[PDB]
Amino acid sequence: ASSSFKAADLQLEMTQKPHKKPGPGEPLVFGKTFTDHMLMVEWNDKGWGQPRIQPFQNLTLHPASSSLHYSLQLFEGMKAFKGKDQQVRLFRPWLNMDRMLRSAMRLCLPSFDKLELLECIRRLIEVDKDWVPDAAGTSLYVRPVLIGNEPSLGVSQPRRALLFVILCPVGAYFPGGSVTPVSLLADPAFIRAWVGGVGNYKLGGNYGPTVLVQQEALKRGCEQVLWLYGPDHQLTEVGTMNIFVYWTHEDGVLELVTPPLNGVILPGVVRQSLLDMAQTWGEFRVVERTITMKQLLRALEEGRVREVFGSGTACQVCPVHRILYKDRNLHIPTMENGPELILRFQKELKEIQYGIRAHEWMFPV
Amino acid sequence: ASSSFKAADLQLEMTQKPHKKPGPGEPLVFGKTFTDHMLMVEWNDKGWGQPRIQPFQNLTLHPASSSLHYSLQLFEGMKAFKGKDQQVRLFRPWLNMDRMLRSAMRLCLPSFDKLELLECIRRLIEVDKDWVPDAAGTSLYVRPVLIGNEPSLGVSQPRRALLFVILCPVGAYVTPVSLLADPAFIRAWVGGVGNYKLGGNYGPTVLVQQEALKRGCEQVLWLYGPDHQLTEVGTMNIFVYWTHEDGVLELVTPPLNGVILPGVVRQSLLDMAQTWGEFRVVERTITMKQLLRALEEGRVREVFGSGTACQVCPVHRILYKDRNLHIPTMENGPELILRFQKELKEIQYGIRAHEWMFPV
Ligand SMILES: CC[C@H](C)[C@@H](NCc1c(COP(=O)(O)O)cnc(C)c1O)C(=O)O
Ligand SMILES: CC[C@H](C)[C@H](NCc1c(COP(=O)(O)O)cnc(C)c1O)C(=O)O
Questions:
Q1: N or C: which end of chain B has fewer CB within 10 A?
Q2: How far apart are CA A156 and CA A149, in angstroms?
């Protein structure tokens, strides 16, 4: 018993003022450059309306829209890569569709068919193929969004909603192969999410309270925030990335560990891919288990820690070299291990994402 | 002064297509009906633009507006009451202005001068005075809102923002409510943002409120900790009038520990009760164990919620997991509830002169 919204029904309108691309690899600050078209689907009493694809344009919302009063909003983030030159592929889009639908049900927003949305996104990206860069480490960021849109102040299940997708060409997250480490502020006073909360869904509500904390991290000399949880001070996620630790655990076994999906952390697509990939190799233990600051401190001085990094769509595998804890700067030996594992993960993903290696994880055009 | 828009700069555009005021039938559903005008002020690199009272109209937002991607949004809720004379008064608006500014700083949104916003709100209400109902227990609900509005996908401090205010005539709200108290749902946490009126606090409650209904309750009593403590109920702070374990008669309400929204009505009930001096008034943690045990022992007199929508709201039942708990509120006259309600109406409708009220 559930909705619809079909891809066979798209309508099409092309831009009369096709904006001009970034040119050489120089500008494009992430998220501030948009392509010529966008996807838009409306839902109401008559259910889902028809998809289509229109020129990039402003939204028109009633002043009481629940999307602005009660944060009835959720989003996704995924990437399209252009490799064999002009051939464009989406990395594991199905997982983002699965996650988006779960976020929708948590916020009582309308359900939709994951494959139809994926096909409309495919159609949209097709129209803006030329916006997809092909220089090393660049890609096209895809931002689907679903918002409640009830022109009513009652806190309740909306009877109207809007789904849209916009695209941004992105530069190489790292200047040029320059994989550079980041420093993290790890302060227990800051709490991103709670057990029983909504940290495991991609809801706008989870992000707004982090702006002030990120500003604090900069003022204290760090680049991102390492979110801690519990009296235990466990490591949950870093910034907008899941966190991984490669070290010789306390029982002498070499392992790659990452916090488990206990409800407080976001099930990252890159996170799942690194786990899958490492399990496949079978060269060392790969496990999902709780990581505490106390365990990290001990391992660091017995020189048991090899590499620590974050994973996410923006920055696939991100080295960490320093963590400021309790006034405490902890040097993380990641780079002196020449991010061997980090480097290996990056290479495999590049080969897969840019079509060098055929793989089911990729979705065509 | 630099850092704020000014009431003296107000530009105003009267409507050329009035709405029909709520007809005779009189069915006033909350937040469903809007008056003719709204307030709008923009902020950016050049800072605050000039305030504007304009016809009620849609907002035009860039698809990447941070208000829609990262919930850079907050709001307020307060009421204007029209008394016998026909004079309109705002109830303790300064507290809402203070709370709105605290919410803005928490979300790195632009600061503004509280008195200037209050004056523009005063001017907006004046324009739409004809919308302020005057039948018993009716009022005009005021909804200021401040949202981030940078056309960028980066999660960061916006360089653009929009502040607007819309008004709704409200038709009323006695009768007790039932509450669902289930530990599985967590609304806010220590170190979180439950003490700010941010839209992000509300969206996740929709599903839970739907669950409360399918379970036969009308609202949600939010619990927190192993420590099943009572935080707030629905969109109201929660109060308990009883004889405590120490056998002393008191009025208790959970403390402002970051744990909950500092309600304006809540602060007013505390002030008023403290003033009377007839019984102990305190801010302390309240646990389900203590409640269960106080009920068991007939020490509980009245339990109620407080909030702008429903000033003092009697509670008669709480479903705690399987456990339907009857709350003796109505059989104890809501004696304290009635006295609070009596006093607030006299103050809010101008029967009794008071500093809590702000003119027109
Ligand atoms: C502005 C967009 C969001 C910051 C963002 N999400 C990535 C994310 C991740 C990584 O998830 P994936 O990109 O799906 O692998 C993990 N944890 C949190 C709290 C996150 O926010 C992104 O799309 O990059
Ligand atoms: C639907 C009503 C609005 C959300 C609103 N605040 C009510 C409220 C309150 C009570 O605050 P007051 O209205 O200021 O007394 C307490 N806790 C929560 C979680 C609330 O939402 C208001 O001031 O109208």
A1: N
A2: 11
Q: Is domain B175-345 in CATH 3.20.10.10, yes or no?
A: yes
User: Residue A72: what residue type?
Assistant: L
The answer to whether residues B221 and B233 touch, using CB atoms and an 8 Å cutoff, is yes
- Annotated resolution, angstroms: 1.9
Q: Determined by which method?
A: X-ray
Beta strands in B234-311 (DSSP E): 236-243, 249-253, 280-283, 300-306
What's the gap in Å between A133 CA and the centre of ligand 1? 21
Read off the tokens for A354: 């840019």
A258 lines ligand 1 (CB under 6 A): no
Q: How far apart are alpha carbons B254 and B239 in whole angstroms?
A: 8
Give dist(CA A147, CA B67) in Å, integer. 11
- Is the Cβ pair B198, A108 closer than 8 Å? no
CB contact under 8 A, A64 and B108: no
Q: What's the CATH fold of domain B1-174+346-359?
A: D-amino Acid Aminotransferase; Chain A, domain 1 (3.30.470)
Q: Would you call A107 an interface residue with chain B, using a CB distance cutoff of 8 Å?
A: yes
Q: Which chain B residue lies closest to A199 (C-alpha atoms)?
A: B204
Burial class (CB in 10 A: 0-12, 13-18, 19+), A182: buried
Using an 8 Å Cβ cutoff, are A350 and A343 in contact?
A: no
Give B107 Cα–ligand 1 centroid separation in angstroms: 20
Contact A291, A245 (CB under 8 A): yes
Nearest CA-CA distance, residue A173 and chain B, Å: 13
A203/B204 CB distance under 8 A = yes
Question: Phi and psi at residue B183, in whole multiples of 5°?
Answer: -60, -20
CB B175 within 8 A of CB B206: no
- CA-CA distance, B72 to A71, in Å (whole number)? 9
Which atom of ligand 1 sits closest to the CA of residue A202? 21
| Chain A interface test: which of B67, B107, B198, B236 (most A C-beta within 10 Å) | B67
Residue A127 in tokens: 């129209």
- CATH for A1-174+351-365 is 3.30.470.10
Q: Where are the domains of chain A?
A: 1-174+351-365, 175-350
Known binder of ligand: residue A141? yes
B205 interfaces chain A, CB cutoff of 8 Å = yes
Class of domain A175-350: alpha beta
- What tokens appear for A305 in the block? 């820690």
